[PDB]
Symmetry: D2
Subunit: 258 residues, 4 copies
Amino acid sequence: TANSTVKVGNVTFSNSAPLALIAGPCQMETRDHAFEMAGRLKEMTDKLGIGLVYKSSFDKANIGLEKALEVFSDLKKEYGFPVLTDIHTEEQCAAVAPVVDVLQIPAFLCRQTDLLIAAARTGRVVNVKKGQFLAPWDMKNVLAKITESGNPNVLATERGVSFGYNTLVSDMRALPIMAGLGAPVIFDATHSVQQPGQREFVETLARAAVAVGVAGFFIETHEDPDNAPSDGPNMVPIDKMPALLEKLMAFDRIAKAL
Amino acid sequence: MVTANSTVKVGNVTFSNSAPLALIAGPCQMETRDHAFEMAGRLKEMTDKLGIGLVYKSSFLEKALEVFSDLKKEYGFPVLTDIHTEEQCAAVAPVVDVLQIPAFLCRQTDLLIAAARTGRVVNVKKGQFLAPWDMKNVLAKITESGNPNVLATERGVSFGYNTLVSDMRALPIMAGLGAPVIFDATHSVQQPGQREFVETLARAAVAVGVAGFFIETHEDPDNANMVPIDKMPALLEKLMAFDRIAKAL
Amino acid sequence: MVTANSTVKVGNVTFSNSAPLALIAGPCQMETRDHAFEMAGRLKEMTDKLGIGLVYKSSFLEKALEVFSDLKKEYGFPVLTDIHTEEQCAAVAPVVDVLQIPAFLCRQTDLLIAAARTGRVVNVKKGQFLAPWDMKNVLAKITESGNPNVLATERGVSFGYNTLVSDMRALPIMAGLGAPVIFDATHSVQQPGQREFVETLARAAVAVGVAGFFIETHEDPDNANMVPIDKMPALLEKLMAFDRIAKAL
Amino acid sequence: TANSTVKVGNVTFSNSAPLALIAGPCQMETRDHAFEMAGRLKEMTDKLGIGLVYKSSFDKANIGLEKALEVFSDLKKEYGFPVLTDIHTEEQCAAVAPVVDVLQIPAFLCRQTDLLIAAARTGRVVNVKKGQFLAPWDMKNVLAKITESGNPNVLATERGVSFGYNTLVSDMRALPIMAGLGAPVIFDATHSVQQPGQREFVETLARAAVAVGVAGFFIETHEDPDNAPSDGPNMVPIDKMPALLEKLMAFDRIAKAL
């Protein structure tokens, strides 16, 4: 019993609506860097008519919460977008909820029922990253922990499944399956390509997903991914983002008429 | 020496990962002569309206080759059928434009060589036990035999038990081998040992970029897996809209 | 610098891929104090007769640590429990001999470091998303933190959907990393999202060669997955017979 | 409705009986080479009390039938063992059946119903290699094509399943599952380790399988596997075979009492 349209600040997520973007660097760095990344993402999405949710993690985990919340607060004041971050404990959900619009359950924690309930109880939008060890239908039971806990605003993010050793595959059937559960479906293009333990296939997977039909994309991006503090091999260079997004929007226009 | 053609011309059809999508379509098995002309006429009608190339396919031999020959006289399209032995390649080659290597036989060198030596276009279905880069050495058996006209068909890869998965990365990787890549929508959804997901996989594949689509279709697929023929015009129209974008990028 | 110990001594138990098998066993969750002493007594009885080391395990904290402490006073064995946060490591360490990292947390560096810094033995369950060689970098987070006493537990790897598979090659590969390898028979048969195959997988693992077996067990597993406790003596006797051969070769 | 004991010449296959060995080089080479391999295999199995079925292929396929049948006939005359070879067409089953005791259906052909029926109709023992794309329970339907065709003497050979790309895994649960179908189960140690498109793990997998319980082993072997005409990376050096087999028999003695 999820909301099929999830509205967060100025952003609408729905399998029927134009694509929305969750984007940002993996890890929050300096305040300088945060404002540069968020400014560039806001400009390119403003021009395209794409809603933006700005993302960054503060726990490292495989800047710290206090500092990060200050930066997130100032970003929101300057740019007006909702923000997202990942949470790892019940105490972290309560601590970030005053500022952060969308709480994210990491893939490794997607089965941790008490964390799903704690996120749910904040009344924030909850994005659940589907674990690479889950099947698409398994998400019914995961998302239910949130919706049956009284929070109807859930997003389900596809991020690939384990395929042998050191390989993920993206089963495009996950998208209609999860959409059938009633929550907006988000496609994580950057983690879906990774070699557990690849950037050349981000566009490939993104094009496939948008044509199938998704509410949104989750794309990690950075100005110099090879030199980034975390997750660097996977992130799209920020200067390549406008071209990617323009392409995705062309397909989305067709996909969302059918 | 000899290398795969990135553009493969078959009769009045052009396959290339840079050209508009062409269609390989038909029933699994040839039934009757009348059934063949019906399916083919319906397929040609829809492909004529959309402006897409059609290769008509069926699996069978004497009677079948006469049916194929007559279909070609009447409709002017090329045809495709599966071959299983060296002897079969030789028998069907005077009539059939595309010889198809089934996925279970994609590593059978002697068959690959026989089909190559006929001079026909050879379509190899990628085994569900192969990785996309494994098609390099498969395609090389045809091209090193002197035949540059090869098509590589994606049809899914084994994913745990009784499950296939469509890794869309297979498409650019195989395209990189230098042959047109064909997406088999109807076998890629199979539950080994699902028709609902055929549109899903097809939309994904076309947005990634393919030379063509391979779809098994029938007027009554429950009494024949297959896309009902009455679902083809809507599906194809959607796939052509995505293709136009995919091929311009 | 610091490297994993190929022999890990825990209280009166020795773990090594060259030593006789030792047993890590107990219920999933600690129930009551009386239930704990019962399970433990039954396990110690059977391990005493067979001459095998026993580490008693349970998941929970204040009451639980008092139970563990009393079990140790009475039975003299080491104990193991799962930890989920840094704070938890610190709280359980004064009592619990082996800190266990659950499979879902095996990549959580901060937790790995916290458990390492306690000076206790750390057992890391291999994530079902990891390859066996991926345990190199996991184990290194504990050893580079100054703790050489690590156990590596095999518990299956994802195999398509809702299925795990036990790749017996994981065992020598992980042994090659230099830590004793533990086989989790009860989680390796899991259907994510099967008790019949626990003996099958255990027999295979022991013939390959493992430092130990991890088995969840209960007196009434339907009202608690788990091996019924009354099935343990027969299973263990079989596994010891294979172990003797495996360890001499 | 398979025979739970399959007797072929001097060899007994049963999940209850001491292990039997199917062994030989992948491809038949010279007559010299055939007699050397078969002699060495007969000597080492004679000493251990292990029944031997000598194997070689004549079709190449990813010496030729006429020559191979002559060699097989002379081997049988000299050594007295049953022999095995793989068949690929209905005509090949009829052509080799006069001489060959055990017809083998290759993994890639295990779903080809007409070939299963043709092998069955020869009245020879049929060994079916389980395809790497099959599940253990799928073998019920495969083996049924033989037994329902009137031939109750079938062997089911485990040879690994596809695990991501260029990797096989050996699911040891396949062994009790297939045994539950009633046919003797054979473990192919050499193909189960291979990298599709490894010898150091032949003993690992073999030890696992024998402890679980199997009727037999299928082991490809050659005097100089690195220089062999086919399948060389996978085959056990013939001089390592006695030590391997001695180890397997030690475990088998325990496994077959339980």
